[model samples]
Target: QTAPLPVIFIPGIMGTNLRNKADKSEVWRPPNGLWPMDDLFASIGALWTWAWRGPKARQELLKAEQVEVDDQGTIDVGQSGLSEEAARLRGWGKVMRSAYNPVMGLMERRLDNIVSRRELQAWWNDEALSPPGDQGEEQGKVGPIDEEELLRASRYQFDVWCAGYNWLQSNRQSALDVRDYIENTVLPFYQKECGLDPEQMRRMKVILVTHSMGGLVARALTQLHGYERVLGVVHGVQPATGSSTIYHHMRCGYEGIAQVVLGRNAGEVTAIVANSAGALELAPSAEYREGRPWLFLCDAQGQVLKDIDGKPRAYPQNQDPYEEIYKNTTWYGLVPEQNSQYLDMSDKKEGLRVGPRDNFEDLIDSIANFHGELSAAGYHSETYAHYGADDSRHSWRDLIWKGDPTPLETPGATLNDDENGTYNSWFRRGLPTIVQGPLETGNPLDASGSGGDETVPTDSGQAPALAGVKASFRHGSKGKGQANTKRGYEHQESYNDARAQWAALYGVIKITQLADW
Candidate 1:
């Protein structure tokens, strides 16, 4: 289509707020709706404190969870003269407004990188235009492209789009749903707008601006049916090989402010993450750490425990985390049998489990399969990926469970039948007595890795760039005017930074240059 490039902003997990469909009550509305000052704080406080409902309450809420992308929430398309109804149609209410609203403002009405007719003609004729100034007054201040030139070349203007899905489901399924919107929805809507121009429909393609796990959804689209329509992708802080933080969080629960929102203990945290395929999909895959151990056994001194052969005892030695670690029936196994309540399918509706990959075993198995398949599919040829990497931010590159040294693989792992203390005592595959953790609290229980976005390790976050993605770099670290502490945003709000926005807009312009017009 003569429409420049249509952009889709896919939010990461927990990025989209949820609500109960039946009663239309809030399920997980971390971003406040109204001035519910009393219960508003209560709702948020309940989610954070030990004052929350039990695992059963969490299960009910999760099962009832559905997206709230309807017209009910905030819908402000600044200076566009677009109606609030129009913004709602474009999916303004789905993602975190506090975070993504800036992206909308950046991409919607601001873009002058397209050279003037004179420059565009030369540039289109294969003459490389001069790069912009280096952060002087002239940065991104180029003259606008001539509208008459657009008609002459039949070029397209960019349009913004967003999709908020049920994060509880598998991304494979999510991609399937998005296919309808791409093929049936977006194309048809534009086709109607362009007076049914077949050429425009044929030339039109989408660019994905994905965050965190949404990048996986984008990759899965490439692996499945998303490649044909996706011109390129700009991924922010993606855990390409998955993050070990998922394992740590599920085992010991998130701590501090994060725990205040995500929950406190394994029993509760396990109830949420283990049950959701999409959340579970964030686990470190087989390719993590180059099939090396990212989960290790350490001691009180922060030294990795040595085996009988005096080698550092570690997990996933053979790369099959499923059998080597995840499947271990021992206490410290990824999801030991004792934690069956979290994985219980007793009351799960058969209709809900009817997908191509259902059940915890099948879902987790499919994660590895999907991760491998995604790598096989590779990034879009015109890809741009940026991730955060500052020495100040440390993520779990390798997780350690500290305890007394013991055999690495002693069988008969089971939790002791005592609720005497929260994480007091337990059994494990090779651990002697109870151990500390793969990060029990927010702070690194063991030594945290040096370079990361405090969520994804640099090596993992930069995978797409490593694979030859065109516009790739470490954001938040190299930008001018930013202090050392505030240079890079965290993994969650990576898209909220100025440099990140510029990188995204630059990516859009770069992809559009190759458009057929």
Candidate 2:
């Protein structure tokens, strides 16, 4: 009969609310309060208004100041809310109201319901509320627990909390936000609730349940060495190494079609996604170890295409009909009119560059090095990973191309065409090429292939192994070792699966029991 450990749910991108910094109101609550309004003409008119009315109109649409982040580097909910309550009385409300008729309701409602139920209690906007001490009229407190009664309610009652962040920012920064919350809010609250001193609190730990990019956030958190209090991590379809989907999306012209067809203002959406710090980090990171295949513009022969001087050929910026071979150029350095403009734009003459080759190369080394150090150091608590792998269309491993074998000048260079040999981004899948009509029942083409969970490959999702973390695999067509089983689930569906949810909870309980020993 000990106090149960607490759990925090971290959601993927677009899983949290974003508000304006000027006023204290909700700004981007979807399905109801879609800010930067969807009236195409209004947003378009904004361009002309900025042209004539000057900085005032532009400032109204986009805030020029740096986004507010707490000491842990996460977005500050209190300072980031919208300015005026009356301002939300706009046109998008009518659009959402019109669509909510029982028969015509959008799937967004179902998604919101899932997030509210399975993920967090309060949304991002309410994150700044005071802790459970004073219980002021505006703030709320965790309900008191009874040890004897808790045993009766154990089956149904569990402490569930959430940590929300600005998904548009960097995952590393968001992880810091989680770290700060644990150290500042969670641990302190646990101390007061359990009446444990700081020395005694060391025995208690928190469990993290993360989905999608939240898994990356979890990885980054563990890297902070600030996770002595973390009991375990339940990762649901994490893009540990990175996802080819992002590379393909940026390379292909999907954004253009999505803007026109989805009826979203192109500039605003681009500002959020294209220039997102997190999005920039999602491009497939090339493995830097010797003998490992690297990401590049290569021909069918698998040999990298090179310029006269032997360096990789660079793509031109203005070229149209984006060629698949030269598509890797899209993720270049951050574009202008976006956030973080202070970086030198002088060296960007080589057509939009993601990061310089050397920079990305160095990044790979650092990433591998960080994990190596962590693995060698080990963790205070046992870590567990669960991932899905069944379709190549969704996996980086199946999607990235391995070169055709040929003779090379090495002492004994055996062709490593195995699963762990090549890097992602070699053979990028161009956007949804099998175009389909609105009434079509299935995808025009079967994008599924070797083994992936539809958004992340097993290689990337099961990356905890690189850091010496153990794993449990399921829903995979072909995976080796423990917990490997074919369950036929996709990315989002992994956590949505009833079995997966139960397993995640069971992991927490099992770990809690072990901690007590």
Candidate 3:
């Protein structure tokens, strides 16, 4: 008899905890722990003011008691001294925190519809569950259960654990960490807490449910040293093919909001976000590109910029913005510098080149090989994918166009000195279009071209057929003959939208039922 399978939830970008190494306390747990609401509002107010006052306002805000400071009195965007918690109260957290309730609350509500509160436990914060006061005595342990009882419990009873990690690090690292956690902590804790034996555990498999970049971490976990424990995966809006938005964000920061609200250059914040190793890895990759244009810069006439020979011209540095951003910025003391062909953007090739950055290329190789390796390793674990589509949902188009009926042209676009000395041409360029083929034209904005959940593209969101994983599309139900369409759904909407929740609930129930696993 098989033991009950437990479900683990991995959150997307900025969805995990970062601890202060010195104190071993959580410094960056968003949505749940942070400063006072007043402080949050105050910080946003400063950014709002900066929108009007420009760079001076930004400088003033940094110097205030609210912002984190370093030994050299420079603003620490990497959040050096303060940690994730302290930094969360101020800076972008102020404006972004309030949004969390709506975002996370909806996700939680969606999940609640699938599993009962009695069975689902947010075990991300391990310390809280087993505090210092409760550590040694084995007080919460339940008596062990036999195979028959375990199999019986597998039907109606379940445990859902939310896994958290440092989002600032590479997904590869997080994957290995989570793998160790499953081997060292999760399995033992589940056994002790649920009153199961080693034999029962041997038959039990863990289900991974992930969102955004978290899906990558979970996918990477399957290829790690100890991954036999995994049973299945349910991925939501994963950038399996990489996200062009990361490129936009790393280069432009909050261009739309900041330009209007802060009146400062977008690159100011872009510099800050670029400091993270994890963000760089999520940028578009050659493996996902399949030799196609993941992104391209064009002119106002909607004309693709051509090389002397008449092919589309691509941003040289865009190929490896991670290396470019690091070499150009001083904030990269957090990690050592690495080499890449495009490090200086001196490769001078005209078209898009989808190669890996030197330092973390190995991780990219793992990500690129995830689907294939899972099968190659002879693990027959089931996998399912859920992603959003449509321009009305969360996506690059929404961020760049601001729901404009027409896409922006490249003419007169804001160009910045991309701390790397080269003019940040990628952001300066007009809207990016999906470069992969099967091209179709219909709406003026090419509404079909805008088919994404406002973030992950449908091409990337769908489970790789090559990997034998199934997929379901979750988006608004406006069109006819749409596959797995969810009326009135948006990116991550299944978490909050009732219509989407209902739609996703059906799929979730089907996949998570005891018989299915």
Candidate 4:
């Protein structure tokens, strides 16, 4: 019973490096190595050069086409080239090593039989708020691990591993593959290496640590299938209720230097995100903001414009986000202008794109279904989660398209509404919303946003606690705006923090107590 459970680390979108399955060339897997520095430099140079190219051409590589891409990605380096074969076999090359390897190291060191006197923060062991660092009473040291808890945790040999999935696909599909990995890859490897008997093998189970969209994959596994094989789960910054940030990226494009790689306009985001079920699933679901409104039409001066209903202009008023928000072809809509773009070569014909061949509607349907299932199924029984809630970090909680303040007219400019359903899609078939300049981010300090990890809002991050997880931590920290000030970690990089590492380890340790002889 004391035998430790193997840990599998799952990553979110862009967390896993992607490669072309046909040629084995790393299509998107960026490496961080001494000799591999050449590759990294080459990638940056190529990206800068590609910046000159148009959005569609640049995004072609990332375009998800069913099963053409590979998720195996780069696991490690030093062997034949990438990472040492040992690390590759251990699944180290699957994710961005720089982002996840540090946390993995912490898990291995802490979960193993090691003795240390240093005080560490456990999510459950220390319930006190140590505050943040903005010269406020809230910003303070929060990490704490007791002598007894440390001793208890140091009782097992934990083999920490990373798992990568085809993030372009739906999370339900990723869940199936993750299950296959546990059954075909993890179980067999462990059984042979540990020399465990059949009975012992049956008793064995894995502990999953997930980040961002990876949490959904783990949830699909734990709630719907293969939960019996799961001993516990630790989620970091999971977007359980969906996020408006995805909407922002699609509408306004990624902020800052991210546009250099993620594309500069909605065209690029739509080319990929419009078709990728997993990406579409990240948009606000039915439960998002209680289905109230996440998208806004704001004026140049941060004022919410009015709609035909003579009220504040918002979205998804009919309980169906697919039609009003995701599928809306208007200027501020999530779908691109070219709704009938891609044509399937598989049919040996270039006709209108529909019925899943780069069809935006197909993906929207999948997004709705997938989210519906996840909401109903919920988390695993032994679930634990932590999310970034630093108030200083201004993350998008709602999509605010603000500009010239002069883009309204009759029939063409008027937003059609039936019972205030946001938009009457049927009536406004070819109507246009004449927004002058490109969309930009509004002040997060305004009502459109709230406290978050600069990507996910505290409103969405604390969702696990609302669902009665019992063992959840809001990774909060007070901080000033200075570079030296500790403002806490961002959404994607939350695991890199010491607080997250210890909290995850604590969750694992707590789960082990339920281990039966």
What's the CA RMSD for each of the models? 7.1, 14.4, 13.6, 7.3
Local distance difference test, per candidate?
Answer: 0.61, 0.41, 0.42, 0.63
lDDT of 3 at 199: 79
Off by over 4 Å in 1: 1-4, 20-25, 31-54, 64-71, 76-81, 112-155, 259-261, 308-310, 345-358, 405-450, 476-486
lDDT of 4: 0.63
Worst 10 residues of 4 by lDDT: 131-140
> Candidate 1 vs candidate 4: which has greater TM-score?
4
Best by TM-score: 4
lDDT of 2 by residue, 1-517 (tens): 3464566667664444444455533333322222335765444433332224332222233231333321111121122122222112111121112111111111112212222333332222232122212111111112222222223323221344456565656676778877886777766776786687867777767777776777777767875556767777776666666654443343222232221111133233323344345544554443211112213333454334454577642222122111222122222211212212212222453665565333433443444444344334443345555567565333433222223222221346332211112222344322112111111121222222234665565546545544455434344554432233445466644565533453454344444444443
Q: Give the candidate order by descending TM-score.
A: 4, 1, 3, 2
lDDT of 4 by residue, 1-517 (tens): 3465788988886666665556565555533212234465545634533444465544555655523334454433322222356666767767765567677766765565344455444433343122222112121232233456455555555777677887877888889888888778887887888788898888887899999889989999889774698888988889888887777666555655341235445545555676677777888778765566666676656566787788877676666777887777665666534432432222433443445334667778778988888888888878878777776776766555554324334345544322111232554432232233213444333332256787777667766766777466666653232221456578767887766775677677767665554
Q: What is the lDDT of residue 514 in candidate 2?
A: 42
Instruction: Please say which candidate is ahead in lDDT: 2 or 4.
Output: 4
Error of 4 at 308 (Å): 2.0
Better of 3 and 4 by lDDT: 4
